[PDB]
Amino acid sequence: QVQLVESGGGVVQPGRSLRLSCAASGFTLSNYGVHWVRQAPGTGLEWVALIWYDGSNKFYADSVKGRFTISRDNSMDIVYLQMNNLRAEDTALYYCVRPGIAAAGSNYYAMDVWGQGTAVTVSSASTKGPSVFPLAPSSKSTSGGTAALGCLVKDYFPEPVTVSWNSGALTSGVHTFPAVLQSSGLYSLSSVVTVPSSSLGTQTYICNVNHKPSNTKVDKKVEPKSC
Amino acid sequence: EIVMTQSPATLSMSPGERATLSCRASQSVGSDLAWFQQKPGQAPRLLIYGAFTRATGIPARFSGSGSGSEFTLTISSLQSEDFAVYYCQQYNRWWTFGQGTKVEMKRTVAAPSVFIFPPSDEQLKSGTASVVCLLNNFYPREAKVQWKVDNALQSGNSQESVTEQDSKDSTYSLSSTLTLSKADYEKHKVYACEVTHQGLSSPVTKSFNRGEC
Amino acid sequence: NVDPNANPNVD
8 A cells, every 4th residue: 555665775985975765655745744764783763854744844863963964855756865974873774754643632643654764884895795614514413413514604795695505405404694794894694504414424515605796606515524 | 862661672472472561751751652563674563653542454452551651562362473573652752762672482492502613724714714603493592602712701702693583493593603813713722612591401512622623 | 933743744
């Protein structure tokens, strides 16, 4: 049914500018004030700004006042969030949000329609494909038990990378961890799988790593280390 | 600003049970209080507004109550679709959110299996060394990982990552990755990861000596 | 004075 549709996110260098936009589907956006609410990786929700239906009143969170500017074009029916002098702490998913519904007896309106969010990544890093290193099953793996192995996907930018095992033939016991941002500004993740120790001599395990922003595609065989 | 405080941080529930979520405000917000559901990768969805009014399309098992600075979200007869993070928000004085309550699936304890991975020879050629500790399929979520290098406690040079709760056995898995320079890695012998978890009678240490098979 | 929390929509 009714949706909000945003665009404009991406990777931007610290101190630079970026303009987001928001449009409505199934209703006229200019009939409503419009909010922006952001969510940084791993944390909660933070209100950013509000613009009156007619573009008169504009309001900003203290954290962005003087750096962000909100505007709207009620001919095209589009709301803009102009973000200047961006900093690492402005990295977040940015939601366009409608205050569309009010409780009985109230003139205060709750946020009933949220866009999908456009991602803003403030960073000085350049596109870089990962290195893929094996996480080799231990030589002391339990004889009649379970062994673990994996692939370390280190030093890439931007997100995401994907990982599969044996071209999709191995799915049970796989855990592909969310990436972490390293202090270098590059991401890193591991994908692991637990398998019968008895299979280590006979079954081949390959992790298929894809990092499409850098056109990097790697199949890495993981096996017990010879020593 | 008006500070919104939610409790507990995590609520562990079984389908069919009643979930009770608390939201406190640092000052009265009247009834201008909303509740949101959020699932990974998805935008928040409005559940309740005006403290007690259910939004259109929301099932009746969700209800809000309270007034002033004290509010409660009740999920009756919880269903598997309801495992999510729930935020409250006051919209009386600007717009501020609580930090969320995660409603997760309750189950019996499962101790992690623990594995340690030395840096690969291929990685050592590049100048850096990653040591990885894996905690596989455990419950509850609380887990402590401690790195020691020749009995020196490592602090600040590891990063952890945790999976979303498993849809099939409701467990968690976790990796901890210790980063050292190649030069530091080759200055030390004993690399050890100690895991504390309530399913383990005493902490489990997995370790290796650099150079041994 | 303006109440920033009041109805920002058309009416």
